[PDB]
């Protein structure tokens, strides 16, 4: 094993604070931020990827192991000079000095570089977790420059915990949360007060009730209206929260995650439901978010919640109404083929919460649709839909219909609970409106289409899909295991006397007994066996088999299948042309791998025998799963 020298090429620059969710007269503000750069030339702006966009408005992640080397090669690009400071900032030796000027000061365009051995002084212990949290910031004006925006996260971990892939991922997934009430009586804000807001209409509210940050900025970062973007994780892959509070002396932030419970190491580990974040207390805390859906982080201190802390997060997965991974799924998955175009393009980047100005789907086309391929047959319980924000303009989809496909070939429309002809969905009201439409129940698709019925200024959408897995279903549905009850299967008829009862309940793949299968009362090709599923299912295929009656051999050679949603009237199974002549059995044992070209959407599944051997006789199984459960 080795040690590593890990240099971070980092600078300070401005831009700042977009509001643009929904809730036009938005101000510009112009505070400072830390920024990662590529090298010593300081050119490439090191594009903040989907995996750390939550980080947004503060600095990048500086990271090391125990016996390691940390290096910062820093440039300042701003008006006030700033600096780089943290707890282990091991400055060495003495000098031919005048009472030790150990003052860190970094002038604009000058390059102050410093590097140090990270000793076990910063390190987590055996009683602790994989990695500890620390803060870096600017020490020049440590009152102002924390409100100025120079907040930074530092991660010190155990040896053999990081990767060649950068950072660590061994069942991890890490997010820093940065709780501060910001204020502009601090950093340079004179160059904001009469820069923007004022020209000839000015001279309104000096310091008297104008309090521009106590008008707004309760930060969980600085994307902090009631919403910040990239809090994206799996419901099993057990997440580490890096919770640091900063700011002034009221900046006690009592934070929780509704529906979830976390575990905090200290001496031993003990289990907590909310944490009181104190200014200068840098916490590391873990959870296993086994409640799938959509939640939020909030500071539960009354007044702080009611001015910008009700901030979302999203947990994808299995168990089993989970997101399908519009954040953490596929970097640029499926989209359209023609129906989607504005430069700022289609899915590609139409994901729920995704930040920036180039963000979401965007078409001024009356005949529009988007289309995801879920790569597999999948459960989809619902959809969260949301709009995007323009120049000064609110723009979303207000109504939509959904279509889906199981194959790629034959699509149809959708129909909510007894609704009418077509299921009309309500969309957003605004450019934020996380309108979590559940599909009451089902859709086993692979492909989903969203078509707008009405729009604002364009057909504009970003979204996330709910559901899970089936069970990835070349798996038995429950005829062998008997998850499908003996009450839950009827046939057209059954053969019964005294020595035998060949009831429909017995049509199971490997059954023994005297009457060990289904047989009808007489032998017709308009006969049938019917599985009721007490909820709506997907079918991969039907595995058929015959009977060893001790008398003679008995099996079904050829058959047809019918489906139904109501349970009473029947739409039957077709090829590309006429009905499907299914190839079946030849013996008293041996099961048949008999699957469907379109996989079947159905709650009611009927076997219709055609040709047989000696009598019609059936043992069987269904391969499949649900998706959801009715209409």
UniProtKB/Swiss-Prot annotation:
Effect in UniProt of substituting residue 489 to N: In HEMA; moderate
Organism ancestry: Eukaryota, Metazoa, Chordata, Craniata, Vertebrata
Effect of residue 619 to T: In HEMA; moderate
Result after altering residue 612 to R: In HEMA; severe
Listed result of changing residue 248 to R: In HEMA; mild
Disulfide bonds: 131-157, 198-202, 320-468, 473-625
Effect of residue 449 to H: In HEMA; severe/mild; affinity for VWF reduced 3-fold
Record domain F5/8 type A: where: 4-320
Effect of mutating residue 246 to I: In HEMA; mild
Effect of residue 437 to D: In HEMA; mild
Effect of residue 386 to R: In HEMA; mild
Impact reported for residue 462 to P: In HEMA; moderate/severe
Protein name, entry field: Factor VIIIa light chain
Glycosylation site residues: 109, 417
Mutation effect (residue 442 to L): In HEMA; severe
Outcome reported for the amino acid change (mutating residue 387 to S): In HEMA; severe
Outcome, altering residue 247 to D: In HEMA; moderate
Effect of residue 133 to V: In HEMA; mild
Residues of the full protein shown: 1710 to 2351 of 2351
Consequence the record notes for mutating residue 243 to P: In HEMA; severe
Annotated phenotype, changing residue 55 to V: In HEMA; moderate
Effect in UniProt of substituting residue 472 to I: In HEMA; mild
Biological source species: Homo sapiens
Outcome reported for the amino acid change (mutating residue 221 to D): In HEMA; severe/moderate
